[model samples]
Target: EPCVEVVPNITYQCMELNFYKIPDNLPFSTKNLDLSFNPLRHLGSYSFFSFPELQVLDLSRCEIQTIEDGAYQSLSHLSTLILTGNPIQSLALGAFSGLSSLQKLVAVETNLASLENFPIGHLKTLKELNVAHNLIQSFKLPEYFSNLTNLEHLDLSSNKIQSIYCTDLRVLHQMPLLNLSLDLSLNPMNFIQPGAFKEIRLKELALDTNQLKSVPDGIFDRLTSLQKIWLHTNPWDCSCPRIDYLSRWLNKNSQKEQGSAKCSGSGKPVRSIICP
Candidate 1:
């Protein structure tokens, strides 16, 4: 008889409650917990150890596969942890052990392949980490960001990433004062070695729909506080001289104009698609 729905500000709207477990008179001071469309498959160890003032925990489309080890060990004042469209394929070892004030950790379309031994660098106050459309193929930087020191929006978009070396871009030089917003969109990347994103200082850099044909010299020369760059649906090799250094590095760091970064192979204006 726990088809919950308690709201007076401390929201607790457990909908689609075809609940498998996770219910033991919940409400240890719940603070916004909407266990979405639950058919909860599994989430054992300490799973919400009676919400210690939980803060926004919406287990979206829950059919959760596995998340044992310390499964959120009594969330330390949890902050926005939405397991989007779950089917999470195994995440045992300290499964996000006692999230220390987690801030935005949305597991998009799960089936996580590997973050090695994901503790997410021990979330040192995580600031936006959406593991987009999973099955991650490669990403070994600063050991997955050694203790994400206040990360700022990192959505590993549509995974299955193929390449981005330079020792995987030296882990963004260990987040030197992060203001980063990197979303390696729809992966299938070919390569980007030369000066691989030279240092780093991106505000937004998506590399839209991948399988890039050319882009090497200076790789955005130290991304001088890059404002925005999506390189729309890549396949750009419009006469490769390295596509004229990626068209003068997208006209010296795109704010998106030169005909809006086009060219999935001659759709023109990846700085006037040349090569032919």
Candidate 2:
């Protein structure tokens, strides 16, 4: 005969609301919580106090646009936090301080930037950080990368980044996996410092939809391991005099490097897309 051990736990289903009279001291240690699509606008103090072992927290689509300071202190053991599709503006600065073991924080489609001494610096073991669809203008890179050495993927596309300076793409080199990507699409950059991406072992370099007049004279000079480069949908000006030298260089290096140079504007013939 096997012994049976029952422990207390709490569960909040999807799209449920109006529980204004639930007892304060409910049950055992709750690990998973889903508070999606509800009218629970305010995550008051002690909201999650009864649950200390919370590992997963989903507050997505809850119409929650604000979270008071210390609202998540009770969920220190939290690992995965999903707050997508919420109108959250600023993260009260030190709001996510105690979440040490937090791994994944999905706040995509929210304006976030500068992974400095702010909300993100708290997670010591944080592996993945998704801050896409936000209002990050440039990639000044936060010092947090120094701590998130385990950080693998960083999705910063769909932002307002304009240029790629030294400091902009340096801190990222801290993570070996970070070199795997550096998405700079949907930006206004035309000139990427020739030597800025010198030592970065980028796997995918997303630089499409930019305003580049001409590829830097030696743009591909250093990034030797570059595999796929996203250059379509950009404002490429291939009808310039400087292109003569650039195309000559590319042709001299590898004849199959035609697509390496592309057109940026419309009405430009595909055959004429190559550098003159």
Candidate 3:
């Protein structure tokens, strides 16, 4: 047997098997499958035709380059799919077509530069999406993202995103921003156009490890429900007008902010004083 039964006819562990294809001997009742660290580069259609009951699938670190449409249409019960560390250049719009029950999709470090054509919009049951450490450039979620009514967590960390525009988050603002957690850290962000985050509400936000120099006035004004925030590890400029808003906002909402945002040069915490 090429696979080790992890959970007695239910789960299978066939990871790093040095195999060039999806092993076909797995039982029909297999619910979990881990194929991480494999060299199965091209995932053509019907690759998982033998595993319709699969619920959790891990394809991380597979070095996959190409994927055909409707590849996993057979796994309708799939809830989580991991594709981390794959150098995917392009994806067919129907790459995730039949993933109706998918709740989480992890594509970390996948060489994806944009979500403009990445698909997955029809996944209304989705709750978490991790696209961290990729080449994404904008804060804009595609228009079809408005259909993600059950989405709760979205991670875009370690990307090339620079700034946040009002229109970039229009669709999110239109949806009920109930308990959505957003991570935008580790980017090259330097500016946020004051009213850019006007209408949306978030459970928490991550803005650390970026190139931010100053906090915009009233940026957190309308976000009354935002409970926690990560603002450390940024080049905060605390010189009079530049630091005015953040310093003042800190007085009332200090509990929400997580860490100390030091000044750009003096290395002083902006909450206490500025570069007068």
Candidate 4:
């Protein structure tokens, strides 16, 4: 007899009523908490701590595998937390403790294998972190991500990452101006070590469809405030000394992006595909 539904301004949708817990007489000021199609598997500790003005929390397609420790400790105005299509591989330590105003943390395709040692530095006001299509192979960046410093959008698109060295992103050299908008699309990255994104200041950089064949010298020269860069469908082995320093850093950033970054099926661009 517990099938809650308080719609009015939209939200508080409690479905299926197959509750195994977490429904501690909600509505203490429940902002938005749609427990999507619940069959709730686990999320122990403070569960919902009486929804302390919960911001937005939709445990997407729940059958939540497990999320014990702290389980959203104080819920300090949780910003947006959707555990998308859960089958959560693991996450216990502090389990996003106290939330301190978390901002968009969608666990897409949650089967997260190893965050090396999760706990995600307790999300220091995270800003858009979508763990897209999980089963993460190897992409380390813990050390609290240099205090997150209001992290700007980061989607680890289709994991199973292969490489991005320089000590696995030495905390983006302490986020040199956090202009970050990085999405490592469909991994299998054949390596990208060279100082690995040196000082960092990428406004947008998605290494589309990976398994890269080149790119080394100066590796984007400290990312010189890149405005946009998505190397379409990588497999760029256009020859000549491995495409000579990515064809002189793509003809010296060619106006810093607005087209002409080819290489996939090779229309022969990427700096004239070498051999001059």
Q: Please name the candidate that would achieve the greatest lDDT relative to the true structure.
A: 3
Model 4: per-residue Cα lDDT at residue 229: 79
Clash statistics: count for each candidate: 1, 2, 0, 0
Instruction: Show the colliding residue pairs in model 1.
Output: 239-275
Q: Alpha-carbon error at 249 in model 3, in Å?
A: 0.8
Estimate, for each residue in 1-276, the C-alpha lDDT of model 3 and write its tens digit: 777886888998899788799988878889999999889998898788999999999999888988788899888899999999999876887889788899999989999888777788888899999999999887688898888888888999999999988887778777875578999999999888777788887889889999998867789889847999988889887778768888877766899889887887888787887325
Q: Whose TM-score is greatest here?
A: 3
Worst 10 residues of 1 by lDDT: 252-261
lDDT of 2 by residue, 137-160 (tens): 667776766776656556776766
**lDDT agreement with native, every candidate:** 0.76, 0.62, 0.86, 0.77
TM-score of 3: 0.95
Global lDDT of model 3:
0.86
TM-score of each: 0.36, 0.71, 0.95, 0.37
For model 1, the stretches where C-alpha displacement exceeds 4 angstroms are 1-22, 25-49, 53-76, 79-82, 86-100, 110-125, 134-149, 159-176, 179-181, 187-200, 203-219, 225-242, 246-276
Better of 1 and 3 by TM-score: 3
